[PDB]
Design an enzyme around this catalytic site. Structure first.
Site, PDB file in Angstrom:
ATOM      1  N   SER A 163      -7.524   8.697  13.269  1.00  8.52           N
ATOM      2  CA  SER A 163      -8.766   8.607  12.516  1.00  8.52           C
ATOM      3  C   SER A 163      -8.961   9.868  11.655  1.00  8.52           C
ATOM      4  O   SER A 163      -9.255  10.945  12.203  1.00  8.52           O
ATOM      5  CB  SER A 163      -9.891   8.467  13.533  1.00  8.52           C
ATOM      6  OG  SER A 163     -11.127   8.253  12.850  1.00  8.52           O
TER       7      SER A 163
ATOM      8  N   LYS B 205     -12.511   9.936  22.579  1.00 14.62           N
ATOM      9  CA  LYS B 205     -11.749  10.988  21.854  1.00 14.62           C
ATOM     10  C   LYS B 205     -12.284  12.323  22.331  1.00 14.62           C
ATOM     11  O   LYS B 205     -13.459  12.617  22.114  1.00 14.62           O
ATOM     12  CB  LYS B 205     -11.830  10.893  20.327  1.00 14.62           C
ATOM     13  CG  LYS B 205     -10.694  11.717  19.715  1.00 14.62           C
ATOM     14  CD  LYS B 205     -10.569  11.411  18.243  1.00 14.62           C
ATOM     15  CE  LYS B 205      -9.444  12.366  17.673  1.00 14.62           C
ATOM     16  NZ  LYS B 205      -9.167  12.100  16.224  1.00 14.62           N
TER      17      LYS B 205
ATOM     18  N   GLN C  60      51.060   3.203  -1.174  1.00 15.93           N
ATOM     19  CA  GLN C  60      51.462   4.042  -0.036  1.00 15.93           C
ATOM     20  C   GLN C  60      51.311   3.606   1.464  1.00 15.93           C
ATOM     21  O   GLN C  60      50.574   2.663   1.804  1.00 15.93           O
ATOM     22  CB  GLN C  60      50.728   5.318  -0.329  1.00 15.93           C
ATOM     23  CG  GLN C  60      50.733   5.552  -1.832  1.00 15.93           C
ATOM     24  CD  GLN C  60      52.109   5.793  -2.333  1.00 15.93           C
ATOM     25  OE1 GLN C  60      53.055   5.924  -1.562  1.00 15.93           O
ATOM     26  NE2 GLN C  60      52.242   5.929  -3.645  1.00 15.93           N
TER      27      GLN C  60
ATOM     28  N   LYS D 180     -11.103   5.597   9.845  1.00 20.03           N
ATOM     29  CA  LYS D 180     -12.007   6.778   9.876  1.00 20.03           C
ATOM     30  C   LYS D 180     -13.220   6.420  10.757  1.00 20.03           C
ATOM     31  O   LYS D 180     -13.629   5.212  10.838  1.00 20.03           O
ATOM     32  CB  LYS D 180     -12.594   7.144   8.477  1.00 20.03           C
ATOM     33  CG  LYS D 180     -11.932   8.202   7.595  1.00 20.03           C
ATOM     34  CD  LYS D 180     -11.871   9.592   8.138  1.00 20.03           C
ATOM     35  CE  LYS D 180     -13.168  10.306   7.608  1.00 20.03           C
ATOM     36  NZ  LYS D 180     -13.464  11.797   8.184  1.00 20.03           N
TER      37      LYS D 180
ATOM     38  N   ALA E 258      48.812  19.782 -15.196  1.00 21.53           N
ATOM     39  CA  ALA E 258      47.665  19.071 -14.667  1.00 21.53           C
ATOM     40  C   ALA E 258      46.919  18.501 -15.858  1.00 21.53           C
ATOM     41  O   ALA E 258      45.782  18.869 -16.111  1.00 21.53           O
ATOM     42  CB  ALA E 258      46.780  20.023 -13.879  1.00 21.53           C
TER      43      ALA E 258
ATOM     44  N   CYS F 111      31.278  16.030  -3.913  1.00 25.82           N
ATOM     45  CA  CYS F 111      30.521  15.721  -5.116  1.00 25.82           C
ATOM     46  C   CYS F 111      30.335  16.963  -5.985  1.00 25.82           C
ATOM     47  O   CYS F 111      29.953  18.014  -5.477  1.00 25.82           O
ATOM     48  CB  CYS F 111      29.164  15.181  -4.778  1.00 25.82           C
ATOM     49  SG  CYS F 111      29.076  13.445  -4.639  1.00 25.82           S
TER      50      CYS F 111
ATOM     51  N   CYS G 231     -20.764  14.179  17.713  1.00 24.57           N
ATOM     52  CA  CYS G 231     -22.154  14.308  17.260  1.00 24.57           C
ATOM     53  C   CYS G 231     -22.869  15.350  18.117  1.00 24.57           C
ATOM     54  O   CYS G 231     -22.564  15.487  19.318  1.00 24.57           O
ATOM     55  CB  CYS G 231     -22.947  12.974  17.325  1.00 24.57           C
ATOM     56  SG  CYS G 231     -24.683  12.964  16.499  1.00 24.57           S
TER      57      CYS G 231
ATOM     58  N   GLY H  89      43.045   5.842   1.649  1.00 24.59           N
ATOM     59  CA  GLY H  89      42.108   6.850   1.170  1.00 24.59           C
ATOM     60  C   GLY H  89      42.264   7.230  -0.264  1.00 24.59           C
ATOM     61  O   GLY H  89      41.374   7.885  -0.785  1.00 24.59           O
ATOM     62  N   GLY H  90      43.379   6.914  -0.908  1.00 26.40           N
ATOM     63  CA  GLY H  90      43.371   7.298  -2.275  1.00 26.40           C
ATOM     64  C   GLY H  90      43.572   8.794  -2.467  1.00 26.40           C
ATOM     65  O   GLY H  90      44.162   9.490  -1.646  1.00 26.40           O
TER      66      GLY H  90
HETATM   67  S1  SF4 Z   1      26.185  11.365  -3.321  1.00 22.05           S
HETATM   68 FE1  SF4 Z   1      26.665  13.094  -4.269  1.00 22.05          FE
HETATM   69  S2  SF4 Z   1      25.532  12.720  -5.833  1.00 22.05           S
HETATM   70 FE2  SF4 Z   1      24.600  11.663  -4.538  1.00 22.05          FE
HETATM   71  S3  SF4 Z   1      23.158  12.815  -3.571  1.00 22.05           S
HETATM   72 FE3  SF4 Z   1      24.953  13.026  -2.725  1.00 22.05          FE
HETATM   73  S4  SF4 Z   1      25.844  14.766  -3.351  1.00 22.05           S
HETATM   74 FE4  SF4 Z   1      24.503  14.074  -4.575  1.00 22.05          FE
END
Ligand code: SF4
Ligand SMILES: Cc1cc2nc3c(=O)[nH]c(=O)nc-3n(C[C@H](O)[C@H](O)[C@H](O)COP(=O)(O)O)c2cc1C
EC number: 1.3.1.2
Lengths: 1004, 1005
Positions: A548, A701, A218, A572, A435, A128, A669, A222-223
């Site tokens: 408590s 207690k 393919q 409590k 690219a 990410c 107490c 996984g892409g």
């Molecule tokens: S999925 Fe990616 S975007 Fe989301 S919390 Fe995780 S690191 Fe961050």
């Protein structure tokens, strides 16, 4: 001889020990220039060449963490309300909750939370671009120390879960597969096996669909994660693991099959009976440019779609069938572009052998597409960046590329981008890699999507909310829709669509779905572990409850706590109207017990709070309403009377009459100290009064502020108590300001009184008290209280003899939702006891292997025991030895889950199990002694073991003056002080003496 | 009757953002996400292409600056390494380990004292040092995921706190009096150039005692480059001034308007006028120039760095000059040529002058940039553009203004030699060109004034690199003029190195010798004359800090080293008669789990199953005799233990007294027969004390356990029995914890067995403090030796305030080493000193009162900003920026340091013993009429909502937490319980104030 002087050898061992100076030092500016290189850890700003990287696919991410590093950072996170980091995650992961589980050592509970909202949780942790996503919203950015490493925390928890080898399961509260309505058996196709489809097929599977099929062009799945993201940022085995998780739910994967006019089309899917289809084929083709017309890879030219798969296929074991070799890249490499892809092209070029890499952009530095953490990878590998240049011609001589000619570009008015034909650059190179991005261009594929509508971008048009194309049964997601360009967004597209797919299928079979969206969480066998327990004739649905205290101030808070899942709660402490109190303020303060650390995880609180300010009539009515609405949650009324027989009898009958399952007697107490609770004979008598007033169970207690807590527990039992709660707070004072006034400080006179200390600072005291009572009164029920903040600390009390676990300070530090970490944590701990092949682990922590910054150290012959720390000239030799092993290796070319092999223990089976190891001092062996051993590959050279042995030990460690490596010598006595101060978990271990143990007597 | 246990609509609504466990995965489209992300963004937006308006904005941009919160955290992180590599990598060899140790102990005086001892320009250096190429470059914590210590930020923080105290520098107190110096110290000494090199040189000479030292400086201002060119937004002028005023405290004289130059000051004229030694610290005064720019003027738009950076400084540095002074008006596009520090400072300063856009242009590539990355970064984040591989050829001038510069591409051969390509040009439009190629020494009349010293291959004065001496023995040189370094700290170090050999030389010319060993003096202030001695039970302690009977006193050889380091007293490890000799097990001392899984420095407790000493009584009695013989002013207290047996306690106490101990300490841990230890029963303690009293005549203290129902009853019995005081307290009985499989730690044997152990360290401090307070209250005037988690001067003062006389330490030493005594001593002195300073009573000890900050930088006090509800994120942060900028522009259109004196005398330790006891009392002595409510300083908030969560699930549901801004507001439900304040990560962001409104307890029915 002089007993108080070190002999010469010890004087020598001490040479590097700190001493204070009485003069300022004198060292010349040149002596300092010449010694500086010896100690240098970080890159040298004057070193203009990059380390030999050829065939080195070692992890380069700066965000990777090991256990030690992950715990510190998880503890730093403020675990924020309405957190902005979650708001900025495209899959809305509950970052607070999952980071909270990591700081509680509950890595399973963390991974479960991550995978519930992101089936590709480990991939996303690693790749990410968090500075543009969750991390860019982190509140801690507003501190000098900066935002949390969310990605590395996510990656650490997920990696632990992967190593546990636990399968995903079907949601335990679906009906059985037999009894699912016919709509669930509908045939679903997905096209393409990338993040978008993987996610979409995961979520439909969780909902119950039993006939889901992904069709992938393919031979590999996984892409881009597989085919293009380099092995040194995303290991292939991470992709295999996420795929296998998905196949645990029954998703089928068929490779070798294409969405394409002569093969699979929407019309052919319609004819074979598929009821819906998801398009996740991505952008298959490279964006290209006329000026590279007809150049071959022999001549030196690649597109990013030709090059990255060649490298990935030979570096990624098990991507394909074939072994393939790494591409012959030699000389000067020009990479055209400024996005993600160009920076991965550049760094993968160095792995194939490039000598020099140039990244050349159409615009300026300021305009680079990619995230700064991605740029820094290329930057630190010494790639050169050429801005403001557009390609014009490739020069080919002799069949090879020899250069590329560019023209200079500039922004004008409008910021209009214009090329300047008169201002040219002739850049020599041997290989060029474009690219420029990617597109869907193949007319056979566009025609297979007929008849769905396309937009101006020439992508399938979808409704941004539902992911539906113009044909209601066809959905789409990921790169092919063109809004996402991250893994996590493509994951999110597939998740978004899964819900609307479900809506559409159900409606095609005559069925309606909720208006509020309901995607199932992620589930494992762990989730079925039973953690209920029975004590004094009560059944607790789980052993965690609210003590408590301040979290049980009002009955509406208990109600919310029961709604979050807490098993039980104490009111409590309340009293008869005649004894009503009035609080003062300030009255609860932070603990100074771990120094000046503010925010999460305070190691104690001090309070001068008295009992509840609300009346017995409020509390009695409140226990009735709570027991009516939560019959299965235990409610315990805490009560307190002066030392009066009629009063204790009145107030306990009243609270029993309200429907309480049990009473808890607060013996604080005044009336061997000042409290009725400090005197066994007052305890016994108060318990007798109460035992004959009520028929429900009650618990005394106990205060830890006594010479002998056992005498007070025994008194309660003789008085008729069904158990004892151990323990109340510890009497204490939290400190003073420099001027002498306390904190808290009440009123005009800045006055205070002694308070009660709580939290993890008192856990040693309560653990001793629980084990002392359990040994002296075997079988007598014990409710534990004192520093319980995790499933892991709860299990320590259970093992010590407690049956249930009362919590206060951990909620004051956080909020009532930690119960969900506590329950998952405890299920995982018990589940893990039944796995034979994980018995090397401590709880949820794998045995630590030798790491440097949480990356496995290379297991290379030519590198072990040859005394090379990771700084200065030593580090330079390490990298040279590593580089040669990568070269040597290039010249030297299944996921199956653990099944429990013993029943999973219930709470009743662990209670008391530690007591066996406890006894007197005379039961410990003084023949089986130990000595410290240091793993030099884990050391970070601080010398703290050294200094501690010097000034608190046996002067037994040598600290080398050139390498800063310590060696434990044979004068070690096993004290264990050094292991205890070392900053690296498990860098020092104690082992058994081989040699004979003689005590140092000073004089015989 | 309504539903007591359910929240009314109002509170359901206040609870709307409270966290809740979720039972489903969330659904939120990718589009909605994109739309929402911008609302919460804290950091730079990677798709934003110009930076905010900086015009006239001279506010601090450093990333390393720290406030007190942040500094205490980063100091506690440092491992405080042996033989530390960061110090080896500092050109002035600062003791970073010691000064960071002091910061973590809240001793900002002893940290500043450590920094200035080795570096008289310590604050400047903290702000400007390129630490990634120096000290931080060598930091061990670089081998961790979180990385190396912000050493520079820490140096700057302690130095700023020291500047705030307005304490002066004094001549070293142990030197003879000025009238009593040898004649040699009156030698007339001359320094040329008031920059870092000479300031440091003159400072150390004055520390040595030289009384007649003059710096002659060419300009009307002082500080060299730190004044004239480093920008105000990196180095505020008031920092230079503070360090010059510290130097002037030692009597260094500065004369302005006097140059080294033909026909003004020359070496010959200094020689005629009686000067006995000269230091050349004039730097590199002229710009390095390109023929291609000759004849261009400032009105055409051309500047060198040497004309441009001082023009911005005279304008933005309050009273560098007596001249007021407008900014250079720098408009349109600016080209800066260069890749060193100088060029990046021209780039950022040009934006303060109004530049629309800035191009930094380099001859080579990005890889070959000369500045360190932190310095690059500042220009990067302000959106300068970098153009590599261009060499300038022509400047085009039309209508009297520069309109463009023409460049040629450069490139690198086949040997690393750097050619230009005439057919490859760039014509870059621009309106201002700033040459930053560096600096030179060219002036023929300046060089002539240095005749006859030798000049080297670079036309710089040749010095020996060890001595800084020129080829003339009475002339030394240092700093930029020597050519070896270009940092402040390296120049500071040149002046430091030289001062030793200048001393060596002057002393030779008057016939005296000096140490073979270099001995530059430390930095001193009147804080150092404070007396921290104390007398207790008839014994005089040189300071109140001592080593407890424990691991640091395993060997008498360790006690020797402790006394050498300065510890006022020490106990033996507890010893017994031969028949009682023990044998320890192993493992036996384990780190505490009391502050979670944090490893390394500052363990918050330890647990031990260690027994008493394994060395014999003979060893310890002979040892006490040697120690008392070699250290007659340090107090040695023999700690002893016997079983419950009169002859034994009498035999062993007599043996310990006859060894010459100053006092005894009775360890009442022993078993016999209100517990198992003798120490748990007041009758036995009474009897043991009586027995020991009839046997010895020296004082003796009983050591109390806290593992009793009533520690007072035990203290009182020891007093009735004859003891001269008590030591409170021993360790707390605990079980440190179990491994997930149920085994203990420590675990002994293949049986993995354990037994209860004792907890020590700051986790048990609240227990020890309550024990000390309660004995001091019940037994007033009965001496108390305190022990339990004392680890700083600040916490030792808490115990003194609570009635103790002396302070024993064990765990703070196990966590570190014996040198913390220097920090504890200077810390106590500074705490006592500050009590006499009227101007500093808003402080808590050495902590200034907190000012509202973000990331520890102060919040602009602008009224258009005050209470507009603009948190520091998202679109509110963009508005904050527009308001601050408009104010900077308003300011554009509308164009004394004396030390505090003690006004009381400085308190002695005996003056503060007990002073906190007048606040302690029973519960019924606290007002329940004088109630408070919490109040939040929205300017300090970091929007985390922890106050909100704590008040919802542990409190009174009294805080509203705004869904768009994530600001909390405290409402009138507040009871003042004070839990929000206690969980807030920002110090002093929430404060309790007196309830103004009607306080009625909430009774439910
Ligand atoms: S999925 Fe990616 S975007 Fe989301 S919390 Fe995780 S690191 Fe961050
Ligand atoms: C390893 C260890 C050994 C100790 N040995 C003794 C001892 O021999 N006699 C004793 O009277 N106190 C002993 N103590 C307790 C210390 O003297 C001291 O009271 C305690 O550690 C609290 O001080 P601290 O919090 O500064 O460590 C020992 C403590 C430790 C950690």
């Amino acid at each position: 001889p002089v007993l108080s002087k070190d002999v010469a050898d010890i004087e020598s061992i001490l040479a590097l020990n700190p001493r204070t100076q009485s003069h300022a030092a004198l060292h010349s500016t040149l002596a300092k220039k010449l010694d500086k290189k010896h100690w240098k850890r970080n890159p040298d700003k004057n070193c203009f060449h990059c380390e030999k990287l050829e065939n080195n696919f070692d992890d380069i991410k700066h965000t990777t963490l090991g256990e030690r590093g992950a715990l510190r950072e998880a503890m730093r996170c403020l675990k924020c309300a309405d957190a902005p980091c979650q708001k900025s995650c495209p899959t809305h992961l509950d970052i607070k909750s999952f980071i909270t589980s990591i700081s509680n050592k509950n890595y399973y509970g963390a991974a479960k939370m991550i995978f519930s909202d992101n089936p590709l949780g480990l991939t996303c942790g690693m790749v990410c671009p968090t500075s543009d996503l969750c991390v860019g919203g982190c509140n801690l950015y507003a501190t000098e120390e900066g935002s949390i490493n969310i990605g590395g925390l996510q990656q650490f928890a997920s990696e632990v879960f992967k190593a546990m080898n636990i399968p995903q399961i079907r949601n335990p509260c679906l009906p059985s597969q037999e009894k699912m309505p016919e709509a669930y058996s509908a045939k679903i196709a997905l096209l393409g096996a990338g993040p978008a489809s993987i996610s979409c097929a995961s979520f439909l599977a969780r909902l119950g669909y039993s006939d889901i099929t992904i069709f992938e062009k393919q031979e590999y799945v996984g892409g881009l994660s597989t085919s293009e993201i380099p092995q040194f940022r995303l290991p292939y085995d991470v992709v295999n693991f996420e795929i296998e998780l998905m196949k645990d739910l029954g998703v089928k994967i068929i490779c070798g099959k294409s969405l394409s006019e002569n093969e699979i089309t929407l019309n052919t899917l319609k004819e074979e009976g598929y009821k819906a289809a998801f398009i996740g084929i991505g952008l298959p083709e490279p964006k290209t440019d006329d000026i590279f017309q007809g150049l071959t890879q022999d001549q030196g030219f690649y597109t990013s779609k030709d090059f990255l798969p060649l490298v990935a296929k030979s570096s990624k074991a098990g991507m394909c069938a074939c072994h393939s070799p790494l591409p012959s890249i030699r000389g000067a490499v020009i990479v055209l572009g400024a996005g993600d892809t160009a920076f991965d092209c550049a760094t993968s070029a160095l792995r194939c052998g490039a000598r020099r890499v140039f990244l050349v952009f159409r615009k300026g530095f300021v305009n680079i597409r990619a995230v700064p953490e991605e740029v820094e990878l290329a930057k630190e590998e010494k790639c050169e960046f050429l801005p403001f240049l557009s390609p014009r011609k490739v020069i080919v001589k002799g069949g090879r590329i020899v250069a590329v000619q560019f023209v200079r570009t500039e922004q004008d008015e409008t910021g209009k981008w214009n090329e300047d034909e008169d201002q040219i650059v002739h850049l020599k190179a041997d290989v060029v890699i474009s690219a420029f991005g990617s597109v869907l261009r193949d007319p056979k594929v566009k025609e297979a999507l007929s008849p769905i509508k396309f937009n101006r971008w020439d992508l399938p048009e979808v409704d941004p909310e539902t992911m539906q194309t113009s044909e209601p049964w066809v959905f789409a997601g990921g790169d092919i829709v063109g809004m996402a360009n991250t893994t996590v967004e493509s994951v999110n597209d597939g998740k978004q669509a899964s819900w609307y797919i479900h809506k559409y299928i159900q409606a095609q079979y005559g069925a309606s779905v909720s208006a509020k969206p309901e995607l199932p969480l992620f589930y494992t066998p762990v989730d079925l572990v039973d953690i209920s327990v029975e004590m004094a004739g009560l059944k607790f649905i789980n052993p965690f409850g609210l003590a408590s205290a301040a979290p049980t101030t009002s009955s509406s808070m208990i109600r919310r706590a029961f709604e979050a899942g807490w098993g039980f709660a104490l009111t409590k402490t309340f009293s008869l109207d005649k004894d009503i109190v009035t609080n003062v303020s300030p009255r609860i303060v932070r603990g100074t017990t771990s120094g000046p650390m503010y925010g999460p995880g305070q190691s104690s609180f001090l309070n001068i709070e008295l009992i509840s300010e609300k009346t017995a009539a409020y509390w009695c009515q409140s226990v009735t309403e709570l027991k009516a609405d939560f019959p299965d949650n235990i409610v315990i009324a805490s009560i307190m009377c002066s030392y009066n027989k009629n009063d204790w009898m009145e107030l306990s009958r009243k609270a029993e009459a309200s429907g309480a399952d049990a009473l808890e007697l607060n013996l604080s107490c005044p009336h061997m100290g000042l409290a009725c609770g400090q005197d066994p004979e007052l305890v016994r008598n108060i318990c007798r009064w109460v035992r004959q007033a009520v028929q429900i169970p009650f618990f005394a207690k106990l205060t830890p502020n006594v010479t002998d807590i056992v005498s007070i527990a025994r008194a309660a039992k003789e008085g008729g108590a069904d158990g004892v709660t151990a323990t109340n707070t510890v009497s204490g004072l939290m400190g003073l300001k420099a001027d002498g006034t306390p904190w808290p400080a009440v009123g005009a006179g800045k006055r205070t009184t002694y308070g009660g200390v709580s939290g993890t600072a008192i856990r040693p005291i309560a653990l001793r008290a629980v084990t002392t009572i359990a040994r002296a009164l075997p079988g007598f029920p014990i409710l534990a209280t004192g520093g319980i903040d995790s499933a892991e600390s709860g299990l320590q009390f259970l093992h010590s003899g407690a049956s249930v676990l009362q919590v206060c300070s951990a909620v004051q530090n956080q909020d009532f939702t930690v119960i969900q970490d506590y329950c998952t944590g405890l299920k995982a701990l018990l589940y893990l006891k039944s796995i034979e092949e994980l018995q090397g682990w401590d709880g949820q922590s794998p045995g630590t292997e030798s790491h440097q910054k949480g990356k496995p150290v290379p297991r290379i012959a030519e590198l072990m025991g040859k005394k090379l720390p990771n700084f200065g000239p030593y580090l330079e030799q390490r990298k040279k030895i590593i580089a040669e092993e990568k070269m040597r290796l290039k010249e030297q070319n299944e996921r199956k889950p653990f099944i429990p092999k013993k029943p999973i223990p219930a709470i009743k089976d662990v209670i008391g199990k530690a007591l066996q190891y406890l006894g007197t001092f005379g039961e410990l062996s003084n023949i089986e002694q130990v000595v410290a051993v240091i793993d030099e590959e884990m050391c970070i050279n601080c010398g703290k073991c050294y200094m501690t042995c010097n000034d608190s030990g046996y002067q037994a460690i040598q600290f080398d003056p050139e390498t800063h490596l310590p060696t434990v010598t044979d004068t070690c006595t096993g004290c264990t002080l050094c292991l205890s101060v070392c900053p690296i978990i498990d860098c020092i271990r104690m082992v058994s003496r081989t040699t004979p143990y003689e005590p140092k007597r000073g004089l015989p």
